[PDB]
Design a protein around this nucleic acid. Structure first.
Lengths: 55, 170, 49, 106, 125, 222
RNA sequence: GAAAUUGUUGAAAGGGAAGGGCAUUUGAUCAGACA
RNA sequence: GGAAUACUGCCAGCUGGGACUGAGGACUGCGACGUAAGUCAAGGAUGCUGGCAUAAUGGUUAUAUGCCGCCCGUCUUGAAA
RNA sequence: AAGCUCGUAUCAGUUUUAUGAAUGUAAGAAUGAAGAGCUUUUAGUGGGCCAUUUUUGGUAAGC
């Protein structure tokens, strides 16, 4: 049930040691799944192929 | 009133499968949001995908090429009914594709009691050459020098009382 | 003692947001932009039709 | 000569109401020659007077008046709402009510 | 004295339910204790009840139309209390004061400039 | 006694200095928004010129307006509406979009109309219906010192810094959003458009995601 | 010397109920301010 | 090829008409304009003008009119009855 | 209702992530709230009818 908590606290112990041993912006908190960032997707080989209920 | 939309989707790019096949189709709707929703609804039926598995890459308004030339359209329609779904081919004479599908949706509701959620527009095509126009009610208007009157016209009153006894001449 | 709305009553609009004077002066909402000639490619046009 | 009219004749139709609750504070007035909401926009703010006739001579007249202003257009036919100083008697549903030409924006 | 315009909220009297039907039921207000009363459950078209929303404006509470608080007065020594407060309070000569003493109080109140709400009380000629 | 005009004049000098800081910040935010939207436009044009497709960056901010009454609501969504501070009908709040918040929106879809706000709507919402939670006590904004006194802890020092933290969903979004008392909107000026409000927006109703027409909707409600 | 209940006089209303609430016309009647 | 325009969105663009509201009561604050003094639409209405000064306000009251409005109390029951 | 603590990190008919054979835990995830715990004691209360969704049985049909 709490199998992840002890492991992530051990990861918090690894990231606290890494925090002290570096000029740090810490971020040990888990952030939820963000909205998707912008990307330019190219259609050079992979052509935008049409479909329809032909059927 | 309608609007035609090119809507594309390519089931979200993950590991080991980069750049999928980009599934493109033309969607008649009233606005962009409805077009998007209709596209996902069609994708779930054409193959086994979901709304969360993909992404709308491009939504674009397809304006009509020559909105001044009267065309002879033939629309392949299928729709869910009181019984099982079935194909239908109706021929429509109109100026634009948006206006022709508009007249179809109102006619489908009028003669078959099918709302917007039932109708699957398959293919709207121009019939280029006449005498290949199949339906007789459309071929009715393709005769040489068609001169027909509009007998018995109503005169729209602005008041309640008239002083003439109206003349429905034309 | 009473809530003066901005948007209307330009005086309280200038009480908050001191830039409102500069925004109105340069117009900055009706601001024109320079045009380019980046024509869409053959692929985009053919797949649109 | 015959015409001395400096106002537009109109009819007090009803009170502002639902099916079951009438609001006596707001009276609906049909102005003659007005058929749209757009035409009645000229008539907002103008002083209406219901001129009735009472047998007892109060202050040197057997003629009595109730004042009020046209407030806002009501519906799609040019019938306009009206608020009077003292409300209209409810017996006056279908009575002639005088829409004056002041205050003018002309 | 400068006062706001007086808004009463409820000019009418809060009469008891069925006080106009029966003669044995007084017009004096009582709350309908019964659970199946349509007055208690405040139905459409039933009599309005006293509730704290009808409370008069604090700046214009207890004031007569003239913007004066009425103050009952029996004699000169009690009238002499409102020497300083002439535009706040106005005198009210008590109902039981004789016609002999009312003329004393009225003359004295004219001298100090304290307003009497009820002259013409026992002032027949 | 002294101090009658001396401390007053020094206070006026401090007021002028603080105001000037706000001015150059506002100019910086104005230029930021303008160049941002120009970048979206030009990247779209360049994508078409390359024969490519430009996806936009997914929206990170929604405005949620309650559409339904307090009654005949299941508890599963009724708790959610209290958590989004949508206590009465037509009450509106800003929501940061995550995986955690999007499913909260999916539970309450028949009861709210939400979408993605523009800068113009947020500017008009905060300028007109702007109210702060100062210990409690729904305080009207009206003065920049009122914003700075509470949110100077988190950088924010004026009304437009607060709007900036709302739209450009920042490091201190939670504090600016929770500071803002839930907006109390009127019923829409032009009407709802639809005959029946309780169908999904896609099928001729009001509720659910409308994505962009929330700007048309909320500006009439404002 | 109350009310129930009744007579007379004056006003008013009344086409298979009445009394009650909101609002006003009409008739009746009344309060100040101008001390 | 070179334009216009629709639709959509923004303006801390301008300019009219209409309605309801004026709460507070020496001064403090935040501002705007001004070369400064001073002014202001900036911490909630003032300025000007007219009729009446009593039944003209308004109230109480009898009635008319539009709309609403089961007969209270008890006792049952999940309710009405 | 009364007293004594902390007015707080005391939590929530909610979502997420992870652990699991629409329910179970944990969180240095989200969002929401300043009404939290502990004694002492003091009123009233101890029926149900209707409908929606799961699910097991049923039949001319209801159920």
């Amino acid at each position: 049930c709490r199998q992840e908590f002890l492991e992530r606290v051990k990861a918090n112990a690894a990231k606290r040691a890494e925090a002290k041993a570096q000029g740090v912006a810490v971020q040990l908190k888990r952030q939820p799944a963000q909205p998707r960032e912008s990307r330019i997707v190219s259609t050079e080989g992979n052509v935008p192929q049409t479909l329809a209920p032909v059927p | 009133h309608f609007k035609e939309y090119q809507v594309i989707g390519r089931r979200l790019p993950t590991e080991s499968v980069p750049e999928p096949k980009l599934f493109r189709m033309r969607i008649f709707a009233s606005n962009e949001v409805i077009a998007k929703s209709r596209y996902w609804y069609f994708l779930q039926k054409l193959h086994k995908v979901k709304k969360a598995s993909g992404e709308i890459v491009s939504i674009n308004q397809i304006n009509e090429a020559h909105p001044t030339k009267v065309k002879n359209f033939g629309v392949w329609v299928r729709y869910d009914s009181r019984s099982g779904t079935h194909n239908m081919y109706k021929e429509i004479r109109d100026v634009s594709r948006v206006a022709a599908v508009e007249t179809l949706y109102q006619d489908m509701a009028a003669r078959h009691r099918a709302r917007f959620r039932s109708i699957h527009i398959l293919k709207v095509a121009e019939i280029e050459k006449t005498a290949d126009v199949k339906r007789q009610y459309v071929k009715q208007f393709l005769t040489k020098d068609l001169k027909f009157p509009l007998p018995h016209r109503v005169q729209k009153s602005t008041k309640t009382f008239s002083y003439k006894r109206p003349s429905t001449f034309y | 003692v009473l809530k003066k709305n901005p948007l209307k009553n330009k005086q309280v609009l200038l009480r908050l947001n001191p830039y409102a004077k500069v925004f109105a002066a340069e117009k900055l909402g009706s601001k024109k932009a320079e045009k380019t000639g980046t024509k869409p490619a053959a692929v985009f046009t053919e797949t649109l039709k | 000569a015959e015409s001395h009219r400096l106002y537009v004749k109109g009819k007090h139709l009803s009170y502002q109401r639902s099916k079951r609750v009438n609001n006596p504070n707001v009276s609906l007035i049909k102005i003659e020659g007005v058929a749209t909401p757009q035409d009645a926009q000229f008539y907002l703010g103008k002083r209406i007077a219901y001129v009735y006739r009472a047998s007892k001579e109060v202050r040197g007249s057997k003629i009595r008046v109730m004042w009020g202003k046209v407030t806002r257009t009501h519906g799609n036919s040019g019938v306009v709402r009206a608020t009077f100083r003292n409300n209209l008697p409810a017996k006056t549903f279908g009575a002639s009510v005088r829409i004056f030409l002041y205050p003018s924006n002309i | 004295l400068p006062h706001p315009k007086i808004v009463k909220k409820h000019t009418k009297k809060f009469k008891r339910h069925h006080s106009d039907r029966y003669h044995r039921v007084a017009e004096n207000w009582r709350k309908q204790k019964g659970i199946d009363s349509v007055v208690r459950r405040r139905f459409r078209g039933n009599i309005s009840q006293p509730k704290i929303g009808y409370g008069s404006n604090k700046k214009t509470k207890f004031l007569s139309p003239s913007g004066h608080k009425t103050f009952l007065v029996a004699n000169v020594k009690d009238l002499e209390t409102l020497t300083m407060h002439t535009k706040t309070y106005a005198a009210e000569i008590a109902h039981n004061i004789s016609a002999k003493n009312r003329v004393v109080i009225l003359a004295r109140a004219k001298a100090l400039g304290i307003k009497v709400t009820n002259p013409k009380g026992r002032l027949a000629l | 006694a002294e101090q009658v005009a001396a401390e007053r004049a020094a206070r006026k000098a401090a007021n002028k200095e603080k105001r000037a800081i706000i001015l150059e910040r506002n100019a910086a935010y104005q230029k930021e928004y303008e160049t941002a939207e120009r970048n979206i436009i030009q990247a779209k044009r360049d994508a078409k010129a390359a024969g490519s497709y430009y996806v936009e960056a997914q929206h990170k901010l929604v405005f949620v307006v309650r559409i339904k009454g307090i009654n005949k609501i299941p508890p599963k969504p009724r708790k959610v509406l209290q958590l989004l501070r949508l206590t009465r009908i037509n009450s509106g709040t800003f929501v940061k979009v995550t995986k955690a918040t999007l499913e909260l929106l999916k539970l309450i879809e028949p009861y709210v109309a939400y979408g993605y706000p523009s800068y113009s709507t947020i500017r008009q919402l905060v300028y007109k219906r702007g109210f702060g939670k100062i210990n409690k006590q729904r305080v009207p904004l009206s003065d920049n010192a009122i914003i700075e006194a509470n949110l100077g802890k988190y950088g924010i020092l004026s009304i437009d810094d607060l709007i900036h933290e709302i739209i450009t969903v920042g490091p201190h979004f939670k504090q600016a959003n929770n500071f803002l008392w839930p907006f109390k909107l009127s019923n829409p000026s032009g009407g709802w458009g639809v005959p029946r409000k309780f169908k999904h927006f896609i099928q001729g109703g009001s509720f659910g995601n409308r994505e962009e027409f929330i700007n048309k909707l909320v500006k009439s409600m404002n």
